Ligand binder design. Structure first.
Ligand SMILES: O=P(O)(O)OCCNS(=O)(=O)c1ccc2ccccc2c1
Ligand SMILES: O=P(O)(O)OCCNS(=O)(=O)c1ccc2ccccc2c1
Ligand SMILES: *Cc1c(COP(=O)(O)O)cnc(C)c1O
Ligand SMILES: *Cc1c(COP(=O)(O)O)cnc(C)c1O
Ligand code: NA
Ligand code: NA
Lengths: 394, 258, 394, 258
């Protein structure tokens, strides 16, 4: 069996070829032991603090909420080394790999952010890193590809399937099934086979823990709701985790609505997909009526995971967390608004979370509410995307 | 299940192993695929392992990755695969037919319903590539309810516990992995000790000497996929030559099992 | 007269048209009062902490120093909001502008970083911001120009002169001489007419103060030397300030050597220029034999200021600080090295400082030394520049 | 200095103000510039304000910014400017010649040496645009040592303290700024009360009525630069027409001072 429950209600599991089970079992055992090891926690804390830059600020956004009864704070993961929350968990996973005596790292990446995060962690900790990326993604993310290579990582294009994230995910697993003896698979989100959903949550948990301590210090109470975008679910569960037992705190996950849910061109499997079994887990996903896996569309490349973390599907099913969607245009508007009113350029991914917060505020201007938006990353990387769009509109 | 029992019983009386080729249904097209399958059988195939085209075959190497892609280029769907399976069964009443599936295609319209469809079409076994014994319960139960053999995988590092599980849960045949990775001796004795279904070695089997070695080691037979699929891929422009090569390869591999 | 000394030895002064003296006098008085105002200090500290992300980490770089007796720490200004140290002082200056009752901001920019910093500070604090940038710079820094505009700043190209930084500097002064009544000139470095050299130093002083507290905590002693790149001198004086009276601590400023000092294509006026009077101050500068002002060349656009802060010229003259130069190739090598060995992409500006530190280590591998390099900013902005260069070499 | 004293003494006996045009030496070329200057004088200019081309004229508007640029396009250097100045002086013995300088050009080869060069060439005053009274010491001292009048600027917001300083330190004439910004009544009385050098109003003076107004207000005269320079810029293609227009404009402005 396993040490921890691989399921969150009906979602999760370990749907990988038999050959990979020993790898998952080893990882789970190493994780459980690491969690009880004061030395591991100390090293991880050291890296988070002195290398990554934790704790991150909790910024009160006074301008954007003017004229309303909403008080909005932004958890600044955009200020974390690397420019996104991904850095937190790759550092923990890299340490786990070393705890298991592994010297190589395998990672998958779509937009390229996880690839960059995996590469920097591997460079710092002396791990040989090889990254799999969809061919179409390699072509469209030249900047991130060059960054990975500058940091010594090996970038491998994947031309199979749709040549995107899910395809890179497959290639990663194919490789690991034959090299797990010396290589660790650094999965990029709170999804995939157990123990990844659990490990990634625990290695992103400081986001929520810090937010709780900071909001209590600044406001003397917990927020009415914490809001986060949901691509795969890591930054969201990272923010949610420490508040799960604080029943008065709303947990709101925001999936990308793309051109609009009714257009079929979106990335909201949790609320508009259908439960299936893929990427080693049972979870809602983007799939055809026949069961073939489809891609997730969003103006934001980072919210392209065609499925969603099992724990999110679970929290939704029991009504502990609520999930909504935000379209390309709503995210773009939030992006423009934060730049102009707070002088912060948010990642288009994070802009989805901000957009919903803005909607909560604008739809009910006189409702007194204390909101925290997880600003998962910075958007310097999205200025061209936003630029091209705006110009094409006159 | 039934058909595998009879096959192995017959093969045993003739002191020979089984040669089981694998091919993706609908590759490179439905018509050509049906011809390929009839060629494989006529050439000596004792049983068949047939894959249903899937968007993300995360347990297959490039060769089979392309087989799925060619099948998709032909618009091959799971429904058409079941139509093909019914026909194959109507043409060949005794040959064991095993499907190579990925979990989502089995789970899609209901696990029980999938195995029910397998039974009405004449399928004998189903191997779900991404379902380890740990997650097998619903699948093996549905399989057994519809007289379908649930195929379990015995990896090269399999410990005693796994061997015992594979031995008690499996039916039809035990899949003996030749190695780790994707498609492209002591355990055999342990499996027999635990009354496991006859072992069929698979992965990397591409030559007659490998088939003879498998049988010598105590395996009931050997499975070959990529080697078969490569022949299809290299002769796409020449359908007739494709069948010719397939027949020559299958007859060679089968002869080695005698 | 003035409240504070406008000179650092023979360097500095207030060489501006008579019409601008009241503006300088007002600013000096507002600064002096602000420095004694607990409320101003509290607001500034609040912004630095909760908005900008201070304190910044002090990262020990173990990999890069392997095999030597050098212990190297990097003061992480690259993790500051905006990606560079510039953010610190623009926040202070923005507060000063508001203290004086000004509602508009005028700023000059070359590479565009100061323009971006000025824009974000102005967006946050509700100031109308207009930025002057050399036409050739506007053309070559499209990303930064778009960022400024996204944050509500008005970007104005300057086609006069060489159409670069110095030209933008002139246009800024021309504008201010006729609008100082309601606009504050947010100068971008520790140079220009008094009180700017002093104000900018004091508003960047936390870099050195934090570094001192952090190194004392981690090593129990002060560093043998603190190293920083010198474009205009702000990040360097920011790092140096709190250590000036700690005579055992070496202060090393690194000017850009470009293609090599002997080629004449460099940006090292302090050690290879000649003292002159321009941009409101008496300081060493890049000038022809006739006294015409020349441009500073460096692979790094940010080290393009054709002169240098007066206090640096002074510290050099008395031997308190030492200044050296690093060529394009040496900076590029340090850039590549940090990426690969520490997983940190440094700004090409900062790479000059790192390069000299690497030289100190490599030339005398057995010399025991505790060094701190001011990592003034991140280099995500330089990946294309570095990319194009490397490829053109095979 | 000397020449300014005589000029204002003479102008006073004729109850008229002085009209002083400004032009950049070498704009658009050395030869044409020398002709422009002779035209200005022949047309009625009482004194001249001459700029030495500088790379960064941070106190000048676009019109003069371009004058400097045109001069540079002609390769005009400070040394050539001094050659021009010597010639202008050799041709016109009594007209006051004032230079408009930027600090670096004065400081470049030594402040004392610069004023020494001014004296040997026949220059009468020097106004360093970016040197406020606060930094003037070395400049005004060097000027006085070589019988050169150091020109001080009296801004529109000048307080009593500044007025007193400008009055005691200045010589030749006091520069009365018409406004803040760059190139493109009560103070007059205070200056006279403090025995300041005769006031010349400058900045924005582009029409005859402005010259008459300046004199009426009590100023000793008015300076006009951009208005003069614009004429040069608009007639670059027609040298002869350029001189014609300059003569017509200067004669008009001078007539207004009578
Ligand atoms: O000759 P090859 O190409 O090496 O292998 C042929 C694969 N066909 S197969 O036997 O239908 C087959 C395919 C994939 C699998 C993944 C995990 C468990 C078992 C599997 C069985
Ligand atoms: O008619 P305009 O173009 O407005 O002004 C003509 C400027 N020429 S000038 O008088 O030689 C002149 C030029 C620039 C100055 C800057 C600061 C103090 C005084 C100055 C005097
Ligand atoms: C990767 C990324 C995301 C999406 O992934 P999650 O696992 O859902 O957090 C969101 N925001 C940013 C800035 C990212 O880089
Ligand atoms: C602006 C900049 C510099 C150069 O300016 P100083 O005023 O000399 O600090 C150096 N590093 C970075 C990252 C910069 O953005
Ligand atoms: Na998703
Ligand atoms: Na410089």
């Amino acid at each position: 069996t396993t040490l921890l429950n691989p399921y969150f209600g009906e979602f999760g599991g370990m749907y990988v070829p038999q050959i990979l089970m020993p790898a998952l079992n080893q990882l789970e055992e190493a994780f459980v032991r690491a969690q009880k090891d004061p030395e591991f926690q100390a090293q991880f804390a050291d890296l988070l603090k002195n290398y990554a830059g934790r704790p991150t600020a909790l910024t009160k956004c006074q301008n954007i909420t003017a004229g309303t009864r909403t008080t909005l704070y932004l958890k600044r993961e955009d200020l974390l080394h690397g420019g996104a929350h991904k850095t937190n968990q790759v550092l923990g996973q890299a340490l786990l790999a070393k705890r298991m005596g592994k010297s190589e790292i395998i990672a998958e990446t779509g937009a390229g952010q996880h690839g960059v995060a995996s590469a920097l962690a591997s460079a710092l900790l002396g791990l040989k890193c090889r990254i799999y990326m969809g061919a179409k993604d390699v072509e469209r993310q030249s900047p991130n590809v060059f960054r990975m290579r500058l940091m010594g990582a090996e970038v491998i294009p994947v031309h199979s399937g749709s040549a995107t994230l899910k395809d890179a995910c497959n290639e990663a697993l194919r490789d690991w099934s034959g090299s797990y003896e010396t290589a660790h698979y650094m999965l990029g989100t709170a999804a995939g086979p157990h123990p990844y959903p659990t490990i990634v949550r625990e290695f992103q948990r400081m986001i929520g823990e810090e937010t709780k301590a900071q909001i209590l210090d600044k406001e003397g109470r917990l927020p009415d709701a914490v809001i986060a975008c949901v691509g795969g679910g890591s930054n969201a569960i990272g923010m949610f985790a420490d508040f799960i037992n604080d029943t008065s705190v709303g947990l709101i996950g925001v999936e990308p609505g793309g051109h609009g849910i009714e257009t079929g061109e979106h990335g909201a499997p949790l609320k508009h997909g259908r439960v299936g079994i893929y990427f080693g887990m049972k979870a809602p996903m983007m799939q055809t009526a026949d069961g073939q896996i489809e891609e997730s569309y969003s103006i934001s490349a980072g919210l392209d995971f065609p499925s969603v973390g099992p724990q999110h599907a679970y929290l939704n099913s029991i009504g502990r967390a609520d999930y909504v969607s935000i379209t390309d245009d709503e995210a773009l508007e939030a992006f423009k608004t934060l730049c102009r009113h707070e002088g912060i350029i948010p990642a288009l991914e994070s802009s989805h979370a901000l957009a919903h917060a803005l909607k909560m505020m604008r739809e009910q201007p006189e409702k007194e509410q204390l909101l925290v938006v997880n600003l998962s990353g910075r958007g310097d990387k999205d200025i061209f995307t936003v630029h091209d769009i705006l110009k094409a509109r006159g | 299940m039934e058909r595998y029992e009879n096959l192995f019983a017959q093969l045993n009386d003739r002191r020979e192993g089984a040669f089981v080729p694998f091919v993706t249904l609908g590759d490179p097209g439905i018509e050509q695929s049906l011809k390929i399958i009839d060629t494989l059988i006529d050439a000596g195939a004792d049983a068949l392992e047939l894959g249903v085209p899937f968007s993300d075959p995360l347990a297959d190497g490039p060769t089979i990755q392309n087989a799925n892609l060619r099948a998709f280029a032909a618009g091959v769907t799971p429904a058409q695969c079941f139509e093909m399976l019914a026909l194959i069964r109507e043409k060949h009443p005794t040959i064991p037919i095993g499907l190579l599936m990925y979990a989502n295609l089995v789970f899609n319209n209901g696990i029980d319903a999938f195995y029910a469809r397998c039974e009405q079409v004449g399928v004998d076994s189903v191997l779900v590539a991404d379902v380890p014994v740990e997650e097998s319960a619903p699948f093996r139960q549905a399989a057994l309810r519809h007289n379908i053999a649930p195929i379990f995988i015995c990896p090269p590092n399999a410990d005693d516990d796994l061997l015992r599980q594979v031995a008690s849960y499996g039916r039809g045949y035990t899949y003996l992995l030749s190695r780790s990775g994707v498609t492209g001796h002591h355990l055999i004795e342990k499996l027999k000790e635990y009354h496991a279904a006859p072992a069929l070695q698979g992965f990397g089997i591409s030559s007659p000497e490998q088939v003879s070695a498998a049988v010598r080691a105590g395996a009931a037979g050997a499975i070959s996929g990529s080697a078969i699929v490569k022949i299809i891929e290299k002769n796409l422009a020449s359908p007739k030559q494709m069948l010719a090569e397939l027949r020559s390869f299958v007859s060679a591999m089968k002869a080695a099992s005698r």
